[PDB]
Design a protein around this ligand. Structure first.
Ligand code: KT2
Lengths: 187, 178
């Protein structure tokens, strides 16, 4: 229940401070990108933000380094907002091409859920104290709470997909692009 | 335990990343008008009332300029951008100081949290977690290698309907003591 409270808090933080701010205008930015910059008839950027939730909270900062079949392609147009005294705080998202048998098999806006980096740290540093098994518990509850939030959130309208999975980023037999592609091909 | 996550979040996902590069962005900014102070000033209003425009809290806090942007690859975002704002502090219509200044955004998150039924967070929960957030953040930075006299936290209560309080005067008091 204390792993509940931490995870509950980070999921609400993630919604209040990011998803609720960017999901309203996401499809507009994607549409702008597809109309004017990407006229590949089978290579349109898909309409949803894909959010990676590795349940071990192992979050590399470079997505491309994690898999050879993920290639960094471009950025969406930036989104700016005055926030808590910061003028023109920048919200940015990255577009990736997903490769399969040397072909561009998918194109999407893709990123990790950055709160998982905090769950990982607090299982690393004594002053936070959490167990690795706390971490794993908190990650599941984070995903579950986030799922709950998005289900009822007006800003989420077929424009966000959570991709939760157990495999480390270290793992010999796991393809991150294949994980993303399987979900993409379901829409 | 909500405030503990948010405090570690603010350190792990922000303060530890920007504080090591702060002294150099300020030096790059210093190209006559006044030297900026060496420290990031972080406002921690315990009522979690966090306006997006600082002049809305005090018209004597006026925006002056931005630092040069910091970029970093983060959680799959290429060149995530970290920006900060330089403000002047007026006293009798005239500039008395300038500093990099912002609110701790997790406190805005606690406030909005407490406004949403599904978060299950009372106004009383909110103040208690505001305090815990400040105490946690402080205990973290006391030990953090990246905090090297490059950050100043200002936590404060001001009751409802009380304008005896000048945020600009209070920041000026801290700048003058340092
Ligand atoms: N003042 C200031 N504060 C920042 C900044 N950067 C992070 N902070 C805060 O420091 C702590 C760890 O931030 P972190 O990134 O780990 O978590 C975030 C993140 O996942 C997501 N978010 C938000 C913006 C965003 C983005 N542009 N791109 C991708 N994700 C994004 O929403 C969470 C809560 O955002 P919030 O804003 O309320 O507080 C966070 C959080 O308390 C910053 O530049 N300026």
């Amino acid at each position: 229940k204390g792993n509940f409270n931490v995870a509950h808090g980070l999921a609400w933080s993630y919604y209040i401070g990011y998803l609720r701010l960017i999901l309203p205008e996401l499809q507009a930015r994607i549409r702008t990108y597809n109309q004017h910059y990407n006229n590949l008839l089978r290579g349109a950027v898909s309409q949803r933000l894909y959010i990676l939730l590795p349940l071990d909270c192992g979050v590399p900062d470079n997505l491309s380094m994690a898999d050879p079949n993920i290639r960094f392609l471009d950025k969406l147009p930036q989104q700016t907002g005055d926030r808590a005294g910061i003028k023109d705080r920048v919200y940015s998202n990255s577009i990736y091409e997903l490769l399969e048998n040397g072909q561009r098999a998918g194109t999407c806006v893709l990123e990790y859920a950055t709160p998982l980096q905090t769950l990982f740290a607090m299982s690393q540093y004594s002053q936070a104290g959490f167990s690795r098994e706390d971490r794993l518990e908190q990650a599941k509850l984070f995903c579950r709470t986030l799922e709950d939030i998005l289900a009822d959130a007006p800003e989420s309208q077929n424009n966000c997909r959570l991709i939760a999975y157990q495999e480390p980023a270290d793992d010999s037999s796991f393809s991150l692009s294949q994980e993303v592609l399987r979900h993409l091909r379901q829409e």
